[PDB]
Design a protein around this ligand. Structure first.
Ligand SMILES: *[C@@H]1O[C@H](CO)[C@@H](O[C@@H]2O[C@H](CO)[C@@H](O[C@@H]3O[C@H](CO[C@H]4O[C@H](CO[C@H]5O[C@H](CO)[C@@H](O)[C@H](O)[C@@H]5O)[C@@H](O)[C@H](O)[C@@H]4O)[C@@H](O)[C@H](O)[C@H]3NC(C)=O)[C@H](O)[C@H]2NC(C)=O)[C@H](O)[C@H]1NC(C)=O
Ligand SMILES: CCCCCCCC/C=C\CCCCCCCC(=O)O[C@@H](COC(=O)CCCCCCCCCCCCCCC)COP(=O)([O-])OCC[N+](C)(C)C
Ligand SMILES: CCCCCCCC/C=C\CCCCCCCC(=O)O[C@@H](COC(=O)CCCCCCCCCCCCCCC)COP(=O)([O-])OCC[N+](C)(C)C
Ligand SMILES: CCCCCCCC/C=C\CCCCCCCC(=O)O[C@@H](COC(=O)CCCCCCCCCCCCCCC)COP(=O)([O-])OCC[N+](C)(C)C
Ligand SMILES: CCCCCCCC/C=C\CCCCCCCC(=O)O[C@@H](COC(=O)CCCCCCCCCCCCCCC)COP(=O)([O-])OCC[N+](C)(C)C
Ligand SMILES: CCCCCCCC/C=C\CCCCCCCC(=O)O[C@@H](COC(=O)CCCCCCCCCCCCCCC)COP(=O)([O-])OCC[N+](C)(C)C
Ligand SMILES: *[C@@H]1O[C@H](CO)[C@@H](O[C@@H]2O[C@H](CO)[C@@H](O[C@@H]3O[C@H](CO)[C@@H](O)[C@H](O)[C@@H]3O)[C@H](O)[C@H]2NC(C)=O)[C@H](O)[C@H]1NC(C)=O
Ligand SMILES: *[C@@H]1O[C@H](CO)[C@@H](O[C@@H]2O[C@H](CO)[C@@H](O[C@@H]3O[C@H](CO)[C@@H](O)[C@H](O)[C@@H]3O)[C@H](O)[C@H]2NC(C)=O)[C@H](O)[C@H]1NC(C)=O
Ligand SMILES: CCCCCCCC
Lengths: 165, 197, 176, 176, 176
């Protein structure tokens, strides 16, 4: 909702990743035979931030839905909220009952928006447990691959000699 | 010997004019109402911009440590001024979003910011029937309670407005004085009339 | 690849409802990221003026794409907060965006002494409630129009991104 | 009503700062002239700072309330009556207790509605300031840009070197 | 000095209320300023890998400081916007944050036929009003918890900034 600042955070992290890309481009060689690891990871995290911007936008769309724009169906709620987890007195009375009716209508619309909000929160928790795993696994795989890229034991693989004094 | 005076038009444009504009922005943020929510954006974007100017200037300043050039002193002045603008905007927003449920207004704040300052700064501001009657009485009492709550909210928001205007005047004065004391210090650096050689 | 990401996000802002005050945040931050990427492009790309490269055409394309997204985003946002007190919905607006288009939008999934003063005051409350409900229905019509335009432009911009990353990079890539 | 005016404008100014950065590392630090591009950058950065100041004024006016400000008849005449027309803008103690309670409710509701009416008038004042600033600046922006860049595009060299020499110094037409 | 300013400003988002939708703005913009300053640093200081200098230790301390600030800020926003319909406040949280820490402070300003239809409607209205009051009381308790947490973390982060600028720059400075 207004003030949560989901897209703010996401797109600002994308901006920071862009600045880091500019900084890396000042440090990597200009060869085109292989993609280095830090640029690969920058691309990965930028794709992840793009997908999470998409997810935040979708969650904001769903959580902000109203009966005027979209109809909430039984099947959607069941797929998310149930599965994934005298003349004067006559004027007086007329006015009073109209007031009560208007109030009831407003409040029922409010309840509908609330259902949409909860659907959004559910999507959100699931998308979180997916994003954490994705980002952590990508980061960890890439960088332990780097850590494991160690010099051979012998200068020439087949040659058994160390060629040292 | 070659006594040579520099022509700084390039630096003037590319570093000082942007900083003049940034310092202007750092004064405006106190004219904004907190109900907009565009206050941190302004302040911290100004800070980011003066950081961009610092980056710009990085590759153009001697890397010696016998003194600080008036240009970097000016940039640090504007940077710290934007920082304090951020701090005080945070303070104003805190005061503006205060309420009795979270804060008790003390007497010194009330006095200073509602009695002393505003003049200076130019602000100056039968069973069924029984059920129905009890329900309407409850409604009326809730409404009057909320009116009082809103009155106190408005007192806090007025404190915020007053602090904001005070900060506006203070920052205009500080920025102007510092900028002009730095520029006058720079205009009076003219090569001597005799080179002593 | 960063240009692809920026173009996708540009097209993406059009699924964000104006209720969240973040359409401009998103679009303008995509624009800022693309300006910083122009900054790195100027360092990795030849600074010659003999011709526009392919990357340069693509960069200009994505920048114009982002900027047009921002402009139409502003128009949508205004169509959203378009009060009835000052604007009245014309005939084409409620004829195209309310009676024709929502029906050919399949990927949408959207809708298609003092005792006397007392009764006088209750009647005044009813009067104000009625007027407010009318104005609110009007504002809801405006919001629905904005939503329909937003969906249309989502589709248009996704398709433009597709055909743009294909066009600029098809003829040369088939010569290869 | 969308908290995105200042964000928009100040992010535009950040982009302009980035462009100023890219420009500063393209020319020598000479002082015999301001480069046309730096001239335009200063002009446009100042104009955007003014846009930001103006949006701040508009917001200040928009968020005024009877609790903090007074809607002077001068301001009404100016920004609600005159200028909009110019800018061409669109438009038994128990029962007695209950009776006194409903009277109090009505009193408070009427006060609230007066509050909201004056708030709406302040909002219209803001809209008027907004259209005024648009019709004053956007022409200025466009015209200054065009002026600068035609003054630049019409800087063809003199077609003849050595001002006081009718000779073209061309291999085609020698003299003797 | 710029890194010091960024640290000091990260220790400040905790005096920024959450009703102000600007905490992420402030924190993440400090992070952006620090990233651009990371560019500055890499341009200025050496690219040595012989050891970790003091500039690097301080930059990484500041960056982790900002990241922790943002994380706890998100926690605070989540507690503040913690609906009572789905979250009932525990008892230990109320005992600690509402009942103990507020008093443990001294420097703060915190707190411590038809007629039947009409009757039906008015009674409904009052019942809904008191339900709304209960929900608001719960939401305000959550807001109070978040505000207390914010004060605590403000103190903690200012203290961390201070002791950090001293520690990272004490061993050598005294030796000089
Ligand atoms: C760092 O980079 C260097 C390269 O700059 C790596 O050094 C390479 O290491 C490989 C593995 O240790 C070497 O492979 C071994 O090469 C030798 C020699 O091969 C040469 O001579 C062969 C025989 O020549 C006779 O027979 C031919 C066929 O009948 C005739 O045509 C010829 O006239 C002669 O009569 C020849 O067939 C071959 O093409 C070469 O000219 C082999 O004896 C070994 O069996 C190869 N394998 C092993 C396990 O040694 C490779 O030669 C060597 N290159 C250089 C430039 O020294 C070094 O390993 C890298 N270190 C790393 C990555 O840590
Ligand atoms: C500007 C247009 C002025 C609009 C009118 C206005 O309300 O100004 C207001 C302030 O006016 C200022 O203080 C000027 C602030 C302008 C912003 C400057 C930011 C750029 C800094 C560039 C360096 C006037 O306030 P007021 O509420 O009208 O005063 C109450 C008077 N009374 C008590 C008699 C009621
Ligand atoms: C409000 C905050 C004030 C900020 C003060 C400030 O930052 O001064 C800055 C410059 O500023 C000047 O030197 C200009 C002089 C103006 C005086 C500052 C206004 C004081 C009140 C007016 C009424 C400090 O610059 P610096 O980067 O610390 O310069 C290095 C100095 N050193 C070599 C000693 C390290
Ligand atoms: C052109 C794509 C248009 C599109 O698919 O938008 C759709 C997806 O909207 C999104 O999911 C966000 C945009 C992602 C599109 C991916 C790029 C396609 C190339 C519009 O989304 P929606 O209509 O608001 O959701 C309807 C839900 N329903 C499908 C159950 C009814
Ligand atoms: C800090 C302590 C958090 C206290 C709990 C908390 O507030 O969780 C908040 C998360 O708020 C966050 O921001 C969690 C940050 C986790 C980010 C992932 C890093 C750790 C990943 C590896 C780990 C809110 O979470 P919640 O969805 O409201 O949880 C239900 C709480 N309940 C059980 C009381 C209903
Ligand atoms: C600026 C922040 C000020 C601040 O947070 O004040 C508050 C916390 O104050 C503290 O808890 C102090 C925390 C450290 C402030 C920075 C110290 C730098 C050295 C003061 O307590 P409060 O109840 O938050 O506010 C009281 C009213 N006042 C803010 C007008 C004083
Ligand atoms: C530019 O640099 C040159 C060289 O550094 C400066 O010349 C030197 O100036 C100093 C101070 O005036 C001289 O010292 C004094 O010389 C006078 C001569 O009468 C003597 O009486 C004093 O007791 C003292 O020795 C110095 O001799 C002179 N020469 C050199 C080569 O050092 C010059 O002054 C500088 N110009 C400017 C504008 O600063
Ligand atoms: C390109 O640069 C050359 C110089 O490097 C220019 O030629 C020189 O231009 C100057 C200024 O116009 C001439 O000086 C003038 O001479 C006349 C005649 O004496 C005098 O009346 C003027 O008051 C002025 O002093 C100079 O004679 C001329 N020649 C040289 C070799 O310096 C040339 O004009 C430049 N071309 C262009 C198109 O910019
Ligand atoms: C006589 C009943 C008036 C109802 C007022 C409702 C205020 C929310």
């Amino acid at each position: 909702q207004a003030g949560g600042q989901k897209c703010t955070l996401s797109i600002s992290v994308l901006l920071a990743q862009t600045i880091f890309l500019f900084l890396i481009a000042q440090k990597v060689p200009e060869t085109s035979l292989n993609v280095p690891l830090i640029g690969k990871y920058l691309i990965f995290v930028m794709f992840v931030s793009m997908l999470i911007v998409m997810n935040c936008v979708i969650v904001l769309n769903v959580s902000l839905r109203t009966p005027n724009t979209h109809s909430l169906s039984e099947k959607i709620k069941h797929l998310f909220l149930g599965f994934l987890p005298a003349p004067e007195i006559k004027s007086c009375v007329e006015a009073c009952n109209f007031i009560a009716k208007s109030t009831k209508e407003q409040n029922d619309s409010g309840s509908e928006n609330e259902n949409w909000v909860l659907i959004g929160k559910v999507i959100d928790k699931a998308c979180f447990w997916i994003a954490l795993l994705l980002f952590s696994i990508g980061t960890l795989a890439i960088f332990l691959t780097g850590h494991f890229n160690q010099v051979p034991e012998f200068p020439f693989p087949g040659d058994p000699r160390k060629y040292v004094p | 010997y070659l006594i040579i005076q520099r022509k700084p038009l390039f630096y003037i444009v590319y570093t000082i004019i942007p900083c003049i504009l940034i310092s202007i922005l750092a004064i405006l943020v106190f004219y904004l109402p907190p109900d907009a929510g565009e206050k941190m954006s302004l302040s911290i974007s100004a800070l980011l911009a003066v950081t961009v100017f610092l980056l710009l200037l990085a590759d153009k300043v001697p890397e010696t440590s016998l003194s600080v050039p008036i240009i970097i002193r000016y940039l640090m002045f504007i940077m710290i001024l934007v920082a304090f603008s951020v701090i005080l905007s945070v303070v104003v927003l805190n005061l503006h979003h205060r309420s009795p449920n979270t804060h008790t207004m003390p007497n010194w704040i009330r006095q200073i910011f509602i009695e002393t300052l505003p003049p200076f700064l130019w602000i100056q501001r039968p069973q069924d029937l029984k059920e129905a009657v009890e329900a309407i009485k409850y409604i009326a009492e809730q409404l009057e309670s909320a009116s009082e709550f809103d009155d106190l909210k408005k007192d806090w928001q007025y404190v915020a407005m007053v602090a904001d205007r005070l900060f506006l005047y203070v920052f205009f004065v500080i920025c102007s004085i510092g900028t002009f004391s730095i520029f006058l210090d720079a205009s009076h650096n003219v090569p001597p009339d005799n080179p002593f050689a | 690849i960063p240009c692809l990401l920026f173009s996708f996000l540009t097209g993406l802002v059009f699924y964000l409802p104006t209720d969240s005050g973040e359409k401009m945040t998103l679009s303008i931050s995509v624009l800022l990221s693309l300006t910083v990427f122009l900054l790195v492009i100027v360092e990795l790309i030849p600074s010659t003026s003999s011709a526009v490269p392919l990357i340069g055409k693509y960069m200009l394309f994505t920048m114009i794409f982002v900027i047009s997204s921002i402009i139409i985003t502003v128009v949508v946002i205004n169509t959203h907060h378009r009060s009835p007190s000052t604007h009245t919905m014309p005939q084409w607006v409620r004829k195209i965006f309310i009676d024709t288009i929502p029906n050919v939008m399949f990927f949408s999934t959207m809708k298609r002494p003092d005792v006397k003063s007392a009764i006088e005051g209750v009647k005044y409350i009813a009067e104000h409630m009625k007027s407010d409900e009318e104005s609110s229905n009007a504002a809801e019509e405006w919001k629905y129009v904005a939503m329909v335009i937003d969906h249309i432009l989502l589709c248009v911009f996704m398709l433009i991104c597709i055909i743009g990353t294909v066009s600029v990079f098809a003829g040369r890539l088939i010569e290869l | 009503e969308s908290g995105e005016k200042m964000s928009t404008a100040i992010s535009v100014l950040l982009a302009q700062a980035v462009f100023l950065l890219l420009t500063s590392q393209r020319l020598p630090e000479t002082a015999l002239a301001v480069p046309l591009i730096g001239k335009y950058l200063m002009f446009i950065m100042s104009l955007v700072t003014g846009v930001i100041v103006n949006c701040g004024i508009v917001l200040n006016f928009h968020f005024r309330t009877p609790s903090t400000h007074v809607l002077s008849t001068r301001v009404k005449q100016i920004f609600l009556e005159k200028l909009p027309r110019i800018l061409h803008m669109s438009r038994h103690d128990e029962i007695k207790s209950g009776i006194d309670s409903t009277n109090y409710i009505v009193k408070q509701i009427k006060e609230k509605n007066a509050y909201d009416e004056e708030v709406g008038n302040w909002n219209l004042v803001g809209q008027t300031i907004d259209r005024l600033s648009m019709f004053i600046i956007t022409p200025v922006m466009v015209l200054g840009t065009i002026f600068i860049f035609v003054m630049g595009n019409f800087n063809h060299p003199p077609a003849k070197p050595f001002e006081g020499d009718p000779f073209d110094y061309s291999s085609d037409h020698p003299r003797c």
